[PDB]
Amino acid sequence: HWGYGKHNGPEHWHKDFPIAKGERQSPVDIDTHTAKYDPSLKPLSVSYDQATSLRILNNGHAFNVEFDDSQDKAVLKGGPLDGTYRLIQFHFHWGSLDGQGSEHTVDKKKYAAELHLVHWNTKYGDFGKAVQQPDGLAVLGIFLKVGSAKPGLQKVVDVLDSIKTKGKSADFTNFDPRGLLPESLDYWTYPGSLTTPPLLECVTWIVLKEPISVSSEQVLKFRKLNFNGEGEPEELMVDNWRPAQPLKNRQIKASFK
Ligand SMILES: O=C(O)Cc1cccc([N+](=O)[O-])c1
Ligand code: NI
Ligand code: NI
Numbered sequence: 001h002w003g004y005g006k007h008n009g010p011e012h013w014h015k016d017f018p019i020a021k022g023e024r025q026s027p028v029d030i031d032t033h034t035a036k037y038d039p040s041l042k043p044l045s046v047s048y049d050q051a052t053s054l055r056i057l058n059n060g061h062a063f064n065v066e067f068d069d070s071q072d073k074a075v076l077k078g079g080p081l082d083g084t085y086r087l088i089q090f091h092f093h094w095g096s097l098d099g100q101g102s103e104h105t106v107d108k109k110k111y112a113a114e115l116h117l118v119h120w121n122t123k124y125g126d127f128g129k130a131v132q133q134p135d136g137l138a139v140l141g142i143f144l145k146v147g148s149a150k151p152g153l154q155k156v157v158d159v160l161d162s163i164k165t166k167g168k169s170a171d172f173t174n175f176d177p178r179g180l181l182p183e184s185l186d187y188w189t190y191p192g193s194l195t196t197p198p199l200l201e202c203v204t205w206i207v208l209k210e211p212i213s214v215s216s217e218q219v220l221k222f223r224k225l226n227f228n229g230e231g232e233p234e235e236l237m238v239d240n241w242r243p244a245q246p247l248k249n250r251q252i253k254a255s256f257k
Contacts, residue, residue, distance in 0.1 A: 002197050003061070003227065010242050017199045024201045025245040026192030027103035030252055035188055038253040044185045044206065045078040046140070046178075051087065053175035056159055060166035060227055061196060061240055062091040065156065065175060069120070069127070074177070076119045076138050079206055079255065080189045085119035085138040088127055090177060092116070093195075094222045096238040098146045101219075103195055103241045104207050106143075111211060112219055113144035114241070115180060134191070136202040142182065143211035150214045152179020157221045165230040182210035186256035195242040209256065 002008050002016065014020035051074035055066045066089045067074055074087035094113035095101025102111035117140040120130035130136030144150075155175055162170045186209045193201045225237035 004240050013197055013199065017197050019193070019199045019201065022193070022199075022201060023248050024191050024193055024250065025199065025248075026195050026203060026205060027105070027242060027244055028190065028192065028247050028250070028252070029105045029108060029244045030188050030207065032107050032254075035252040035254040037257045038255065041080055041189075041253065041255045042078045044076070044187060044255070046076055046181070046185065048074045048087070048176070048178050050074065051175075051177060053172050053177075055169050056156070056163055056172040057169040058163040058166055058225060058237075060229075062093065062237070063160070063163060063225065064089045064091045065172055065177075072122070076117075076140060076206075079187065080204060080253070081138055082135070084122045086122055087117060087119050087177070090115060090117045090180070092144070092222065093241040094144075094219060094238065095241065096223065096236075098216070098219065100239070101241055102143055103244075104141060104143070104205075105244055111143040112146050113214070113222065115142040115144060115212075116140070117142075117177065117180075131194075131200050131202045133202055135204060137194075138204045138206060141205060141207040142180065143208070144214050144219070145211045146216050146219060147213040148215065149218060150180070150212055152176065153214055153218055157218050160221050160225060164224070165226045165228060165232075167229055180212065182208060182212050184208070184210045186210065186254075188252050188254050190250050190252040192250075 052068040124130040
């Protein structure tokens with residue numbers, strides 16, 4: 001019964017999941033000076049025109065916006081990837097304060113939040129099988145800084161009062177995730193893991209260099225969510241980020257000079 005506290009947070013997870021101390025754990029600090037520009041990188045293709053959002057769920061640690069992943073409707077390809085990766089869900093990690101919240105860091109800088117668009121490799125047939133493979137997932141990570149509002153985020157923010165507590169869901173159709181992307185698709189990439197239990201080492205991370213801007217008010221609404229279930233003491237859903245882990249024997253590659 002894991003979480004983000006003193007008693008059950010990141011620093012305890014290894015007792016249940018020894019892979020927490022593995023060779024390709026996420027997130028990491030991105031040392032921009034040491035990331036090497038890679039000309040082998042094929043261009044990134046984000047094809048979200050046919051996306052079909054279905055539902056938004058408070059899963060007790062975050063909220064997930066879920067997609068129909070039963071066809072190639074929203075796919076990621078190119079970049080460092082071989083083959084086609086289908087969007088299953090997106091979620092965020094965020095802080096109690098604007099000065100922290102991201103999982104990845106950039107030259108030790110923490111952003112207020114980080115958006116994760118999770119895709120699985122269609123060669124494995126479904127998500128569950130894909131997470132058992134070293135190349136099973138591709139996660140597109142986007143930093144959030146506080147400034148101007150992100151118009152394309154407001155629909156997500158406004159429904160959060162309907163899923164305040166763990167296990168609540170709401171219909172969430174017709175949401176266009178294109179409205180959450182920055183202008184540039186320049187990126188860093190490296191091999192890593194999921195950042196909650198079970199910490200599986202199945203992710204090709206693709207972290208965009210350009211953050212999106214959200215308003216103070218938008219992020220405040222994230223912080224009104226609850227980790228707890230209804231009828232349990234209230235514990236605000238904040239600081240649901242794992243800190244940076246050792247890079248070990250990995251290289252971070254840059255798609256840009
Ligand atoms: O890495 C995370 O944010 C945690 C996590 C946990 C379970 C599934 C996830 N997913 O990527 O579908 C992500
Ligand atoms: Ni548990
Ligand atoms: Ni995540």
